[model samples]
Target chain A: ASQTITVGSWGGPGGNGWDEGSYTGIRQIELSYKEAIGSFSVIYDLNGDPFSGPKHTSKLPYKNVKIELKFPDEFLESVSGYTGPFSALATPTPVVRSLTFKTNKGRTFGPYGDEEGTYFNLPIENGLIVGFKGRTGDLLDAIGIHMSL
Target chain B: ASQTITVGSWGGPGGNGWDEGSYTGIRQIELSYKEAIGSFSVIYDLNGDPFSGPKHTSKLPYKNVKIELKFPDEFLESVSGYTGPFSALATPTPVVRSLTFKTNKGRTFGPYGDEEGTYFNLPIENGLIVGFKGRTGDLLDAIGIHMSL
Candidate 1:
């Protein structure tokens, strides 16, 4: 069965702190599989252009970012029976949810010390990979199966 | 062999939130072993004043409070062989070695928010039941267990 999955990022323009240059990056992952076996990937955009210099930096616009999905035998086989493409079709899609700003970096604290903030609650559908992102982008660089599912 | 143990309370005067009332009414426990089995009973000083009461409304004037003990079990039934009373004796002694309090509380304004405060780490010990009273002479309520040596 073919399925359409939604993907996007949600967070503020700057990081959890008030420093002008200090900002957080948002990343997300989604997994689709039957019986806990499936493929996953993530998408993210750095809040600000914290590029040091032109020589060492690339002008990757902080626009719509999409990542190709990858699956490993361990997780793929864990689900029992199912074989499918590891990557989603490449195309430009409008972000289904509007992003919001928060003073909190992660789950521990709220933005600007206030616990209230507008945030996205992306859901993981059967054929869709879905998740939310926050200040720290370190989760993006992580390898292996995304536990968001 | 039969063994008797002593339990007591200590702390300073009121107003400073350090003193617990006089140890007037609380009872201590004692144990006796004839063969392989043993019997025990707790004797409290009912006449002693309570830590918190109509007379004392502030914090208990208790500080560095502790319980002390001494005992002997038979040969085949070594002091170590008896499980219950042995633990009661060896417990509260370690508070002197492993107790620390650090401040980390109350409304952090930045990303972390305001749920931080001071905490004290006390290990579970057997044998001693040391504690403080509230200024009103009321016995403070606490829960803990002891381990046998």
Candidate 2:
């Protein structure tokens, strides 16, 4: 009865697309960043099965941070961020600059990188975020969500 | 980067299960019935392409109904109904007795057939339904949905 729909990959068109697919819960989100968003990895709970996704990264020296979510209880509710040109390349490519995550329990994660760019926010109602998909080059480029009931 | 998940097949598992798959829009939903649900068919939109799904039916003399939805705009938002045993034979089989559909524009379809069984309801949030899957036999034996984002 409940249905789902894909929202967006807000940022720039630069990298190849990757899908994190649908899952029961997002156990952890590991992010490495500095000025522009750098490496990103996720640990997920797929129907009680644990799995780690591929790490998307860049060559920049980064500060790593990990956020753990309570599975089967706590869930991702919304995502907000900024996207702008990396400014490092000769042909400056647009990438995610800042990222913030909100949970069903009202917990907030980080604006991990510099919050200076075009902003995009997704707040889910009646359901929760089940998975993620995006474009990832040397850095996290574009971001999208899999929303379901 | 949107992903999909299969939801349910409520009622008795009597016949073969069929999937309608994901689509851009539902152009029309055609149904045939007399006392119990008889036959069902769908016309779909797949990324600017047109497609007609297979009809699921039974050996009953029936009356038909067709419901058209505005593509890329008006969409199915929720489904609610009742399911109970079809008491036509010595050994009865459960089937979907009634179904009601709601759209994003808040238009409601029917509580088609008798509303005398266990109930199920699915209301979507943040997204729209793209496809359907179900089991069918002497009547619509069971029904399910494909949720995506």
Candidate 3:
């Protein structure tokens, strides 16, 4: 029997929490950010079926970046990034600061925002990265991975 | 729904063929080799249900090497190796010459024998390696992987 394991929802627990659930694999990923990560969404590959996840966003004029994987051929291997205070303050709110994705083909995608923050990395071993979930609000507050083995 | 994809069984058709079938993941592997690979076997983790595979061997007195994986923690990611004529002759018989296994944890195990032959490398992407199959006789004649997505 196969099992799904949740890694982490790094960063402070703020904003509305969301779960994208699990799927066969990830087909595409779209992220919006400026200084801190602003929004996130993904297209999942459920066997041959394609399912688009809801876009978790915040109010910010952000720069957009996207990646369309070679479905059934290429695959997302691991994801890592940083989290820190939204602003430089004594008691500032925490939010996702940056993100980077690596594929089985050795291809790498962005450290989208500022890399200066608490780090979290998930390298899928003995399993497949099936989905992602976290919190989103004034910024991409938290993030995590869904691994199926 | 998750589906399994079979890769290769590269070598000449001679010895008896065997299938280790599919499992949750591989827990350990033991290989016997000399000038050519003489035998192969593995222990599997079927969601914590430990299952040992039958040892497939030849008459040759070969050197043995084994790997014990951290089950439920570390996972096998990819496997690569070589295949060539069993001997230096015009109509030489082909057999598995060498093998190497890699984990998601960045660990590597053996190119166990000679590295001179037709190369075959399988880097699992968008899926998990659940099982393996191949042919064996006086030597490991062929090999393959069972990838689930």
What is candidate 3's lDDT per residue for A1-149, written digit by digit as tens? Answer: 55455545576677789989888888999888777788899999877999988888667888999988898878876677878886532326788889888888889997898887756544543456778878887788888766654
Q: Cα lDDT for residue B130, model 2? A: 69
i-RMS, each model, one decimal:
31.2, 12.5, 12.3
Off by over 4 Å in 1: A1-9, A12-120, A123-149, B1-137, B144-149
True contacts kept of 2: 0.15
| lDDT for position A60 in model 3 | 81
DockQ winner? 2
Q: Write the per-residue lDDT of candidate 1 for residues A18-119, one digit (tens) a residue.
A: 101111122332332221111223332221212111111112222222222232111111111111121222212211112212212112111111122233
Better of 1 and 3 by lDDT: 3
* Full candidate order by DockQ, most accurate first: 2, 3, 1
Better of 1 and 2 by TM-score: 2
Clashing pairs in 2: A4-B148, A5-B148, A5-B149, A6-B149, B2-B149
Candidate 2, residues A1-149, lDDT tens digits: the string is 54346555777788888877777668889888887677778897877887887777667788888889887778877677887897765437788889999888878996799988766655554455667778877778877776655
- Ranked by TM-score from best down, the candidates are 2, 3, 1
Estimate, for each residue in B95-132, the C-alpha lDDT of model 1 and write its tens digit.
11111111122211111111222222332233322222
Shift of residue A30 alpha carbon in model 3, Å: 0.6
Per-candidate DockQ values are 0.01, 0.07, 0.03
- Please say which candidate is ahead in DockQ: 2 or 3: 2
Q: Which candidate should be chosen as best, given lDDT against the real structure?
A: 3
Give the whole-model CA lDDT for all candidates, comma-separated.
Answer: 0.21, 0.74, 0.76
